[PDB]
Amino acid sequence: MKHLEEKTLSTRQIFKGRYLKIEQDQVQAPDGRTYTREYILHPGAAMMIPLLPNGNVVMIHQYRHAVKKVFLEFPAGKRDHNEETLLTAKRELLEETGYEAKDWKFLTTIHPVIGYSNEHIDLYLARDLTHLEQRLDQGEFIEVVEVKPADLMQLVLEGKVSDVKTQIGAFWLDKFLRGEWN
Amino acid sequence: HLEEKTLSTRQIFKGRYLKIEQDQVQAPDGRTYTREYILHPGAAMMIPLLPNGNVVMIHQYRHAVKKVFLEFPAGKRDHNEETLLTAKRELLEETGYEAKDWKFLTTIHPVIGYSNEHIDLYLARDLTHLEQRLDQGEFIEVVEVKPADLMQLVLEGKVSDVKTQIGAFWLDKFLRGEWN
């Protein structure tokens, strides 16, 4: 769909905060005119759907100050210096929840902020789990929970799983558990 | 127990589009940390279901990711208006359609780590086809999509836009008689 593409004419890093880095670009759009585009430079991420032998999934509660709310989430974290996201996922599953998994399957990649960040999140299904113990980062506060997939889907419908990556995980899990996508 | 207490707030950056809030917070360990996030106006996204069973979707380039995306139409809340008003306006501007039947589905948060953005998702039915009225810097092509085709595209990784993918999943639940 080449007639929709925009051509980068210039880029700069316009701002660096404590955490957020902003790129500002001038682009040539399909009209041949120049427009500004601004977006966050993000390292990428992974998220894991950790399926226990008992059929429950391992989830977390975590407070997110950007939204001033505690969210139910699948474990996740940012990609460290261009590592494969499978490594990110293994590490985050262990650090946030204490689990390791013998069976990892890449499901899909999502883009959560197409208007203003280059973030992508690779979503994985982790099976054949065994437990060790949690190891949280400085400034990271997490409660680990087990959730029945049926209860999770009802929470989705009720608006109680508003975190996009985790809601998408729930729907992919549902497709997997029903044997539709497996 | 997990909640962090705001100690101070500052708008540290305002560009052409993006505004960054930086807060000092006291966390559950009693210690102080910085939190940085985008101040976003909020947004609406619309699933427009045609009488033939297809949905109206768009193709749109997104410079932040350097790809053309398949999306449901959407846009940002203006002057803190009711998001249904946002939805009705953006459905007309981006696709050329109006709808006489609107239903709120759910609110999603696409960037919990670094933006206060929420998106309210709506189902739109009973449609009338007028014409697009695109805004500055907007280039959008309208396409009709069969929901079964949409779900296969999701599986294939060809619907990576979170809001759109979630919309597909909700539509699938509605069309299957599961959620109504």
Residue numbers in the entry:
A (entry chain A): 1 to 182
B (entry chain B): 3 to 182
From the paper:
Of particular interest is the Bdellovibrio bacteriovorus HD100 nucleoside diphosphate sugar (NDPS) hydrolase Bd3179 because it appears to have some of the characteristics of the Escherichia coli adenosine diphosphate ribose (ADPR) hydrolase and the guanosine diphosphate mannose (GDPM) hydrolase. Bd-NDPSase is a homodimer whose monomers are related by a non-crystallographic 2-fold axis. Each monomer comprises an N-terminal and a Nudix domain. Phosphate release assays revealed that among the nucleoside diphosphate sugars hydrolyzed by Bd-NDPSase, its highest relative activity was with GDPM.
The B-factor of the E140 Cα in apo Bd-NDPSase is 3.1 times larger than that of G115’ on loop L8, and 1.7 times larger than that of Y19 on loop L1, suggesting that loop L9 intrinsic flexibility facilitates substrate binding followed by E140 mediated nucleophilic attack of the scissile phosphate. A product-release mechanism where an arginine (R37 in Bd-NDPSase) completes a “fence” around the nucleoside is posible, but the presence of a sulfate ion in close proximity (4.5 Å) of R37 in the apo structure precludes this analysis.
